[PDB]
Amino acid sequence: QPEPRTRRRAYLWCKEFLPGAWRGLREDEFHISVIRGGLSNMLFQCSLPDTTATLGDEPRKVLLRLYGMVLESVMFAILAERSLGPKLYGIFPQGRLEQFIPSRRLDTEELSLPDISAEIAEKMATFHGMKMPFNKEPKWLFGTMEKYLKEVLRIKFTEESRIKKLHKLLSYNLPLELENLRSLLESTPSPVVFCHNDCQEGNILLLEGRENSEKQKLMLIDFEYSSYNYRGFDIGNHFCEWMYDYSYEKYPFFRANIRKYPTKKQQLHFISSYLPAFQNDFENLSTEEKSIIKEEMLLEVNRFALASHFLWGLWSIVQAKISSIEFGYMDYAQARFDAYFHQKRKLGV
Amino acid sequence: QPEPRTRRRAYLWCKEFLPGAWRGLREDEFHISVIRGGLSNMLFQCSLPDTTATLGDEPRKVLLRLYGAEAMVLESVMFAILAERSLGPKLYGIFPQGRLEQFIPSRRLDTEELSLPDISAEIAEKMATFHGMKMPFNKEPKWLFGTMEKYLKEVLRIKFTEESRIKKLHKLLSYNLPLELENLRSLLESTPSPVVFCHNDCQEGNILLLEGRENSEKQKLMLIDFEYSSYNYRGFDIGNHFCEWMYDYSYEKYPFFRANIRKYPTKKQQLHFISSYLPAFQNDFENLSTEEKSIIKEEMLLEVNRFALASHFLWGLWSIVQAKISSIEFGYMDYAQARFDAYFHQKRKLGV
Numbered sequence A: 001q002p003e004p005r006t007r008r009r010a011y012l013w014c015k016e017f018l019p020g021a022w023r024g025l026r027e028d029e030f031h032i033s034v035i036r037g038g039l040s041n042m043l044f045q046c047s048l049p050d051t052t053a054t055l056g057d058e059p060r061k062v063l064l065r066l067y068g069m070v071l072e073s074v075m076f077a078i079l080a081e082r083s084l085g086p087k088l089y090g091i092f093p094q095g096r097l098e099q100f101i102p103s104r105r106l107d108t109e110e111l112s113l114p115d116i117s118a119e120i121a122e123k124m125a126t127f128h129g130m131k132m133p134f135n136k137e138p139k140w141l142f143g144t145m146e147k148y149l150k151e152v153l154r155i156k157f158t159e160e161s162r163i164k165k166l167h168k169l170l171s172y173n174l175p176l177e178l179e180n181l182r183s184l185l186e187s188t189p190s191p192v193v194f195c196h197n198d199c200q201e202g203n204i205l206l207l208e209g210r211e212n213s214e215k216q217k218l219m220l221i222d223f224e225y226s227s228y229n230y231r232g233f234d235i236g237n238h239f240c241e242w243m244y245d246y247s248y249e250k251y252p253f254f255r256a257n258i259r260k261y262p263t264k265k266q267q268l269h270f271i272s273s274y275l276p277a278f279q280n281d282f283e284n285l286s287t288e289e290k291s292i293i294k295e296e297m298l299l300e301v302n303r304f305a306l307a308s309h310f311l312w313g314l315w316s317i318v319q320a321k322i323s324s325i326e327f328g329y330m331d332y333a334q335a336r337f338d339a340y341f342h343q344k345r346k347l348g349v
Numbered sequence B: 001q002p003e004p005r006t007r008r009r010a011y012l013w014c015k016e017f018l019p020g021a022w023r024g025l026r027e028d029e030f031h032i033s034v035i036r037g038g039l040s041n042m043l044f045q046c047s048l049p050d051t052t053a054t055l056g057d058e059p060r061k062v063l064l065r066l067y068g069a070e071a072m073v074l075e076s077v078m079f080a081i082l083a084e085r086s087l088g089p090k091l092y093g094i095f096p097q098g099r100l101e102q103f104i105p106s107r108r109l110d111t112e113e114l115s116l117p118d119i120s121a122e123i124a125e126k127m128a129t130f131h132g133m134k135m136p137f138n139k140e141p142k143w144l145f146g147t148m149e150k151y152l153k154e155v156l157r158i159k160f161t162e163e164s165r166i167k168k169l170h171k172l173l174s175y176n177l178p179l180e181l182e183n184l185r186s187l188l189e190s191t192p193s194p195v196v197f198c199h200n201d202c203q204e205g206n207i208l209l210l211e212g213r214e215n216s217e218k219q220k221l222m223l224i225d226f227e228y229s230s231y232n233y234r235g236f237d238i239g240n241h242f243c244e245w246m247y248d249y250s251y252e253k254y255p256f257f258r259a260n261i262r263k264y265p266t267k268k269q270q271l272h273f274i275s276s277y278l279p280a281f282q283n284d285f286e287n288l289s290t291e292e293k294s295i296i297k298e299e300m301l302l303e304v305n306r307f308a309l310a311s312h313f314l315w316g317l318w319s320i321v322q323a324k325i326s327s328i329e330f331g332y333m334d335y336a337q338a339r340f341d342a343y344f345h346q347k348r349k350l351g352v
Ligand SMILES: CN1CCCN(Cc2ccc3ncccc3c2)CC1
Pocket: A198, A200, A202, A246, A312, A325, A326, A327
């Protein structure tokens, strides 16, 4: 349960924005509980009295999201219209009402289950074929990294620990290294598509009641960082996410495990599912040509995986200065940068 | 024939938002033409050279829309949804200064085409369809009297200089609009009308006659320009449309419209409209008792004609507000008086 200053707001929003029973519902009939609290993007679960029959096809239970601009909204509406996302039941200046999808999030170690990562591949490829009314020019990747790098070189921390950690990070010569990375990635062909850009296990729902479905038990959510971007980044980033488990209950509240990065075999298995789903003609290609393509895609995504480390490393340093959320951001930054340089050595680039 | 800045900015938007031949298009080979000028919602046609080949789906031609001089999230979300549902033009690009839309070969309707039976029948079907839609917006019917209240307040505190505008304003105030509003409200709050997703501005200039289709009998029109849309009393949407039968905005001299009260649809014409509307809006209707059909229709007419009074009042108030702030060449005050003339005349018609 929430505070008084809300739940009423939540009451009004549900009563005004939802059809059916919601329309005549009394403030004492309103059921609401917290799904995730905090200062920003708070989730809530609102529901009709179980003793209330629905008048039409309106939802019994809904997700309320409180922001705590225009593109984010257009995108969610579109994904909703195409059944790629939760339905959009209502939208307003300080949040929105979304479909409540009975489910849990994936856990890190589940990303490696052959059936799971085969469906994530298939879903990412599908996400990747969608037309969106947004800029098709791949500005996002280096634009965001420059934006973050510049912030980082302006960040001053008070406590000695953060100063120390920032100092060790700045000692990699991030500006120079960004240019080394630009060189590498420019010379690495990767089709521009609509990328989720944050395809981590916490954004993948296992839909309850089909945990037994072999190719249809997952849904991708949270598209807040989505944009047109190099394909290799969405895949590389997701592969990186195999190494990071955010459920750790002690500070810094994540574990990094480099050994958990997908093996070549595991990589070939993800992309062997991705490709058929991304170009429908791929399956009919010559056994030999498929491997030509797969070997190339492996080079492609493992290289862009470096951008995942670099971008989210920088991102993490900024979050440290400004976020309230309890999470060891600097240590995570240090982890992403270690994995960065470990991956460079591994690739010999 | 746009200005250097725009067309340069339009070239860029097109090249960066549109797929296919567009993305490799050079500036020297970019075609743009004006469809509407002004300061607010300029319209442009953009296209590929005729010698250039499309690579895939991409359109050969598109409409650029510049917003000119944050409810934009609502408009944009709406515009995008109607597109996904094939009810509006496709949405190719959205950005701070405007949007890229599908170009749809067509012309708009003339006022006197609104009364043509097939036209009127299809408009009624399209509107009913439009009304059945779920939209992620607030379902409380506050738009109508909220907006009028908003305009009335603005109206009460505007002072003109220019003599003729000053006189015209006072004659409108003569009527005691705050009292008159209150009692429009009482009249209407006693007039049941289903709350639905309304277009709210269904005038001829917002209805496309689709090219290639002037032969189809029930499928040659598309409603567009949903800028004023919202959940609202169905009666408003229909009443407002009926009012627009009376108003012709193609008139070339000041005040740049003709009002003709006597072009308002006859009862026979109104019945012909909702005879298409009702089977298009609800399922069983077609096969209800020919006795209950008539009960439904007759009440609806009282409903839509009563709400037509809100059309006159709302747009009259809006028009007065436009006279202060708008620069567009249009006799807003004269148009304000005409709506209010129709308001009191319609009131007289109804004995309310
Ligand atoms: C921007 N997204 C991709 C970058 C990695 N990820 C790190 C992360 C994951 C889970 C967290 N859970 C709680 C707090 C911080 C967290 C940070 C942040 C999410």
